[PDB]
Amino acid sequence: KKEVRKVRIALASPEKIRSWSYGEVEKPETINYRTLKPERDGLFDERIFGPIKDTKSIVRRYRMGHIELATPAAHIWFVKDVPSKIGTLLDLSATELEQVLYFSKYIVLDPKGAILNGVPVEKRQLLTDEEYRELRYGKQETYPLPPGVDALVKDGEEVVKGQELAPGVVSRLDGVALYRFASILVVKARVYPFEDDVEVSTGDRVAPGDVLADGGKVKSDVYGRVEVDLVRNVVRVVESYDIDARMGAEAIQQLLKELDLEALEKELLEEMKHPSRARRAKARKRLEVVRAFLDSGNRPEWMILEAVPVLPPDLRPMVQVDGGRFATSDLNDLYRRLINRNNRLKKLLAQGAPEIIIRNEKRMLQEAVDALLDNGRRGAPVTNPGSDRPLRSLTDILSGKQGRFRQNLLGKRVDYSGRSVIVVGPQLKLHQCGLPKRMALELFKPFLLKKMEEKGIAPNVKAARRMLERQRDIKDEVWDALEEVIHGKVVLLNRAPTLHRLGIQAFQPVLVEGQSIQLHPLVCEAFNADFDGDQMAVHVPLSSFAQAEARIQMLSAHNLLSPASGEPLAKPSRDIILGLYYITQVRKEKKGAGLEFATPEEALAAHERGEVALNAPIKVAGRETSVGRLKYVFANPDEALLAVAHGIVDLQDVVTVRYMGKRLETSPGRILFARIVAEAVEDEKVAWELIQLDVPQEKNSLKDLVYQAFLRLGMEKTARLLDALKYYGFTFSTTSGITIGIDDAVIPEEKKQYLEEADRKLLQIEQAYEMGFLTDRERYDQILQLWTETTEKVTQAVFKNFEENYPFNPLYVMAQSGARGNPQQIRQLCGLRGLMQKPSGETFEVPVRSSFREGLTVLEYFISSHGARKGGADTALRTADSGYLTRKLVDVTHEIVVREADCGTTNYISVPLFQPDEVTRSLRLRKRADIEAGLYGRVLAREVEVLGVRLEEGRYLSMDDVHLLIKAAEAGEIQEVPVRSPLTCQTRYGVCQKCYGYDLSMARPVSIGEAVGIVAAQSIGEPGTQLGLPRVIELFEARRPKAKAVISEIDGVVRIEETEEKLSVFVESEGFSKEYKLPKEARLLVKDGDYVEAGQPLTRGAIDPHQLLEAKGPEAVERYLVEEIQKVYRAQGVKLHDKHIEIVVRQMMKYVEVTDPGDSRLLEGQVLEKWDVEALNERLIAEGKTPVAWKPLLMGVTKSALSTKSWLSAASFQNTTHVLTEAAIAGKKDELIGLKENVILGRLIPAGTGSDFVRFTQVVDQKTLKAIEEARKEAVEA
């Protein structure tokens, strides 16, 4: 019942394994082919895993078995991890020593080693088993003797080298040769005769000084075993004492049993505090392991495993494919192999012990356990021979690109989904999408079944399915049921590359006849989907709760503004823009008569007579008014438009119309546009005030109109305005007749002489190059400058020509309006595409004189093919590169969610209003877009009054406030604005509403509980696809730029010495001077004698963020990073707000490394807030003034993503093995904070609706409220 908050991962005791499992499996018989039921106690046995029939089969998913190995085993992760957990807990070498002990046959033994073989005492040294059992039993040399011969050697003869033991036998070392009847026994032992009782009997191993026999007469002199022979009444003392011997895991277990963590910890402390850093680094590397083992409970004794758990059968099922053959998970094969090996070991130990065979089968079992735990690390165990496909192990199931972690994180398949090609849906409103009738019928199939079961169409659901199974039985009643089903439902449309949040959009389906999905044209840019045939997909959420989600916050009618900025995305598109520009344009032709009209009053009649003739046009360029203004005057807009309907005057003709209160000299087109705006909305005074009816409706004007309407009216009215505006734009674009012919690409004639002049100039330049006054580089620069100047001159001439001569040219009308094209494209069409770049990256000397209006020569087309190929390849790579960048960003910033009470942050950031450096030393107000992206939607840190207006502290900066601040800065009152920011928020995991701000899909302040981190990452990454990018990569991944710029770290004065070898700049201070050397290519930007501060760039180039943080501090480098990121984004024309960059930069520098240790080690770095809390506890909450002096560490996006307190995300991110091992050494209570973890958990995501702030909210109607409240007051008795 209680909510899961922490997941603790830890190690298992053998008792824990026994309690966990329900019985033991000991046959290698999963299931026989004949008996499809579980055969015997094997891997699928019935009574041990739960019944296979109908508790459910989920016990066979939950209940697990176990194997009680007679021989202990150690987990492969703790022996093969890069830091060998046993190899770092113990003093053992991982690469060979640990494996050779744990698989092969060597000896490890602590207690005693003073026995000498030319080598001093042993404390923890390794000796091979061979010399071990040599030293175990003294010195053995044997030489047989023929029977029936009493040789010259007696039972106690001493023998040295060179002595003839026989006529042909010679020994090898000095010692004693014992005689048997029947051999000679050479030993390096000591014999001792005696004549009294024995104190040490046969078998005992004795130390010097201990009594051997005969009381004090005879005492021991060396270590070794004692053998008493009563035939000669003598003691032989071999040199072999009682010495410990263990093999394999039990030995390790012995080690782990004999190792105590507390004394180990103290001696590690001593071994790290005393010497230099060289040993203490690895001392900490193993001391963290020791502290984790000690502080987390679980002792390392069971860190090697005795009872192996057995996976429930349904997690590894053998399921039939065809013809009796069973497809199996390799886990079953590995378990069968392990069971067979264990049973072989069991019966082997039961029957007899051939020692070499026992060692061999111990190695066999250990390798089998290794393979079971994971395959590939030691050899490549494979399936039955002939199929060289490596078996799949537990690590393979968990880890890998397609594993348990990496397959729930995507969920590549969904049930209620479809896809189709999309077509324009202009007849639909913005909150609708056209759905083909067949996919609409099949998608809601259960809904259809239930709804037509509500009526009498079919008796039951089975009859319904059988009737609908064929389309020959369709009826119009079925279609009525269909339209009944989806009256209120919505579906989610999805584009395959989902670069941002708007790639998923809810819609209301409308039944249509056809194959394709009809899409509203206005969302043609929300999706990056054209109509060249590319497809788009549809999903259908089932639960009414999810329907509420989609209809409320994912419905497209409600998301009209970007999350990346305040700009709208539902702005009128190309066609509507062209139509409305055509309807609200005013022409102008000619005045060949006396234009003076203000003076003469007979000029009204005189020029009316002139207009009767051809003296002056109806739209004449009169001094004060056109004769059209005089001739026609309209009481109402209706009269003007009705007179237009009678063809008297066009929609583009100026005329005096008496509007609601004034006489306006406008065209009926502009009046009609104002009428459309006023009809789409309810009130007209507001509509009249929020439009600009004296200029053509260019795309910027439409965008401003839409934004203002959104601000002042809200959601529904803006949507209706967009619908009506699009509809009228379409109709007037149709009836107006905009068309493109070959003659529309008019060629201005004046440019011709321009070319000649350019040509002439080339000649002198060529002559200037012929005389040798110019070098190749400067000549190329001169030619490039001349051509790029004359191209601009020709473009200016082209636009002047289009203005003067043909106001209504289709190319010119779409250039002026925001429909399509750029001046460069129009110049290519009509003028000349002069400069064409070379494959090397430079530009050809010979330009392209021709245009597409004329014909290109073969060579010119062949040359332009180079640039075509370059652009194609660039796009084809940058697509995937930008996707990968977005992946990095979302991984690092997925923890940021606005859950908050307003944090008491007495801190802020001062957003500049003047560019610190637009020239070398000058201040100018930042570009309006820049100030908007820095200030719009922020919160004022403290009250400011600039122009007689009191902007109180805590007031969100709306668009009007930003404009007012910009105007004030223009006047010159303030230069910086103090604002709250995420960079200074004190919220633990996320930001507060005040520190975050005000920009959203809406304008209102952000709701508490939305993952602003994910949308931040998406807004950063989406423009990257159409974007340079290496700079962005090297900035979010904190790296060392190759073009490093020399900077200062201390304030002082600049002393530039012009040493020709290397320019030496001296930062001079009172007590010290710093010197920097600049090579020939290092072009500085400072002047001698200038005052210089910390972090001031001495040379031109990029700045390493790490050294900048070292010099100035966190805030300075944060501002530098944000500005540098914004630089490239502005350079590409993409408008992006700074909230997202600030969020990622804050997540980038949430790590500090302490320097003065407190209650833990010093040279360790992790989350800053942890020392925030810990310093609060150490200094204030608890006693003990130990300052945990930390330094902020700046690491790239990747490293910050990797090092996380939670281990779920780390396991799902890079490598499950090492991460899980680390999280297993210490019981890691993973808090379910962060979003990726709760995705893996599949539970309610913390962000959005799943925020505990809104997760539960009792709701009750009013009448039941009165009932329950009456029960309440009657519950209060008396």
Task: Summarize as ranges the residues that interact with Mg ion (CB under 5 A).
Answer: 530, 532, 534
Rounded Cα distance between 921 and 1166, Å, is 40
Among 495, 502, 509, 487, which Cα is nearest to 431's? 509
Rounded Cα distance between 133 and 1178, Å, is 57
What is the nearest approach in angstroms of Zn ion to the Cβ of residue 902? 7
Return the residue nearest Zn ion (CB atom).
995
Closer to Zn ion by Cβ: residue 494 or 905:
905
What is the nearest approach in angstroms of Mg ion to the Cβ of residue 496? 10
Closer to Zn ion by Cβ: residue 939 or 1063:
939
CB-based contact 720:582 (threshold 8 Å): no
> Which listed option, Zn ion, Mg ion, none, makes contact with residue 262 (CB within 5 to 8 Å by class)?
none
Closer to Mg ion by Cβ: residue 460 or 535:
535
What is the nearest approach in angstroms of Zn ion to the Cβ of residue 1173? 17
Using rule CB under 5 A, residue 1067 touches Zn ion? no
What is the nearest approach in angstroms of Mg ion to the Cβ of residue 525? 13
> Which listed option, Mg ion, Zn ion, none, makes contact with residue 331 (CB within 5 to 8 Å by class)?
none
What is the nearest approach in angstroms of Zn ion to the Cβ of residue 987? 5
Q: How far is CA 1245 from the centre of its chain?
A: 17
Strand order in 633-634's β-sheet? 633-634, 655-658, 663-666
What is the nearest approach in angstroms of Mg ion to the Cβ of residue 538? 17
CB-based contact 659:671 (threshold 8 Å): yes
Closer to Mg ion by Cβ: residue 530 or 683:
530
In the numeric block, which tokens belong to residue 953? 């502290």
> Which listed option, Mg ion, Zn ion, none, makes contact with residue 992 (CB within 5 to 8 Å by class)?
Zn ion
> Which listed option, Mg ion, Zn ion, none, makes contact with residue 691 (CB within 5 to 8 Å by class)?
none
The 946-985 contact track toward Zn ion, x by CB under 5 A, reads ---------------------------------------x
What is the nearest approach in angstroms of Mg ion to the Cβ of residue 529? 6
Within 442-481, the residues that bind Zn ion by CB under 5 A are: none
Q: Are strands 1165-1167 and 1151-1154 parallel, antiparallel or unpaired?
A: antiparallel
Rounded Cα distance between 375 and 382, Å, is 9
Rounded Cα distance between 853 and 435, Å, is 43
> Which listed option, Zn ion, Mg ion, none, makes contact with residue 532 (CB within 5 to 8 Å by class)?
Mg ion
Among 938, 951, 927, which Cα is nearest to 1133's? 927
DSSP string, 291-331: HHHHHTS--GGGGEEEEEEE--GGGS-EEEEETTEEEE-HH
What is the nearest approach in angstroms of Mg ion to the Cβ of residue 883? 17
- Which residue is it, tokens 């004090």? 216
> Which listed option, Mg ion, Zn ion, none, makes contact with residue 534 (CB within 5 to 8 Å by class)?
Mg ion
Closer to Zn ion by Cβ: residue 459 or 904:
904
Backbone torsions φ then ψ of 573, nearest 5 degrees = -90, -165
Among 672, 705, 670, which Cα is nearest to 690's? 705
> Which listed option, Zn ion, Mg ion, none, makes contact with residue 1277 (CB within 5 to 8 Å by class)?
none
Helix (H, G, I), strand (E, B) or coil at 909: strand
Q: Are strands 633-634 and 655-658 parallel, antiparallel or unpaired?
A: parallel
Q: How far is CA 88 from CA 94, 283, 289, 593, 803, in A?
A: 9, 9, 8, 102, 81
Q: How many CA atoms lie within 13 A of 1046 on its CB side?
A: 21
Residue 602's H or E segment, with its range, is: helix 602-612
> Which listed option, Zn ion, Mg ion, none, makes contact with residue 311 (CB within 5 to 8 Å by class)?
none
903 is known to lie in a ligand binding site: yes
Rounded Cα distance between 709 and 462, Å, is 53
What is the nearest approach in angstroms of Mg ion to the Cβ of residue 421? 10
> Which listed option, Mg ion, Zn ion, none, makes contact with residue 530 (CB within 5 to 8 Å by class)?
Mg ion
Within 978-1007, the residues that bind Zn ion by CB under 5 A are: 985, 992, 995
Closer to Zn ion by Cβ: residue 365 or 992:
992
Within 95-134, the residues that bind Zn ion by CB under 5 A are: none
What is the nearest approach in angstroms of Zn ion to the Cβ of residue 556? 32
Residue 962's H or E segment, with its range, is: helix 959-971
Q: Angle formed by the axes of helices 476-485 and 445-454, to 10°?
A: 110
Closer to Mg ion by Cβ: residue 250 or 525:
525
Closer to Zn ion by Cβ: residue 464 or 909:
909
830 is known to lie in a ligand binding site: no
Closer to Mg ion by Cβ: residue 495 or 888:
495
What is the nearest approach in angstroms of Mg ion to the Cβ of residue 430? 21
Closer to Zn ion by Cβ: residue 681 or 995:
995
What is the nearest approach in angstroms of Mg ion to the Cβ of residue 534? 3
Among 433, 307, 295, 291, which Cα is nearest to 16's? 307
CB-based contact 951:940 (threshold 8 Å): yes
- Listed ranges 69-77, 327-335, 349-357, 896-904: which one lies at the site for Zn ion (CB under 5 A): 896-904
Return the residue nearest Mg ion (CB atom).
534
**Total number of residues binding Zn ion (CB under 5 A)?**
5
DSSP string, 1096-1120: -BSBSSB--HHHHHHHT-HHHHHHH
Measured over the CA atoms of residue 237, residue 239, residue 243 and residue 248, the dihedral's sign is negative
> Which listed option, Mg ion, Zn ion, none, makes contact with residue 985 (CB within 5 to 8 Å by class)?
Zn ion
Residue type, 745: A
> Which listed option, Zn ion, Mg ion, none, makes contact with residue 708 (CB within 5 to 8 Å by class)?
none
Closer to Zn ion by Cβ: residue 886 or 981:
981
Closer to Zn ion by Cβ: residue 985 or 1226:
985
Closer to Zn ion by Cβ: residue 678 or 995:
995
> Which listed option, Zn ion, Mg ion, none, makes contact with residue 903 (CB within 5 to 8 Å by class)?
Zn ion
> Which listed option, Zn ion, Mg ion, none, makes contact with residue 1159 (CB within 5 to 8 Å by class)?
none
Closer to Zn ion by Cβ: residue 429 or 942:
942
433 is known to lie in a ligand binding site: no
> Which listed option, Mg ion, Zn ion, none, makes contact with residue 757 (CB within 5 to 8 Å by class)?
none
Measured over the CA atoms of residue 374, residue 379, residue 382 and residue 387, the dihedral's sign is positive
Residue 1107: exposed, middle, or buried by beta-carbon count in 10 A (0-12, 13-18, 19+)?
Answer: middle
Using rule CB under 5 A, residue 903 touches Zn ion? yes
- Which residue is it, tokens 């809406």? 1002
917 is known to lie in a ligand binding site: no
Strand (E) positions, 783-921? 909-912, 914-915
Encode 865-881: b = buried (16+ Cβ within 10 Å), e = exposed.
eeeeeeeeeeeeebeee
Using rule CB under 5 A, residue 31 touches Zn ion? no
What is the nearest approach in angstroms of Zn ion to the Cβ of residue 905? 5
What is the nearest approach in angstroms of Zn ion to the Cβ of residue 1006? 12
473 is known to lie in a ligand binding site: no
Residue 290's H or E segment, with its range, is: helix 277-295
Residue type, 48: I
Binding residues for Zn(2+): 903, 985, 992, 995
Which residues fall in the annotated binding site for Mg(2+)? 530, 532, 534
Could you list the residues that contact Zn ion (CB under 5 A)?
903, 905, 985, 992, 995
Positions at the binding site: 530, 532, 534, 903, 985, 992, 995
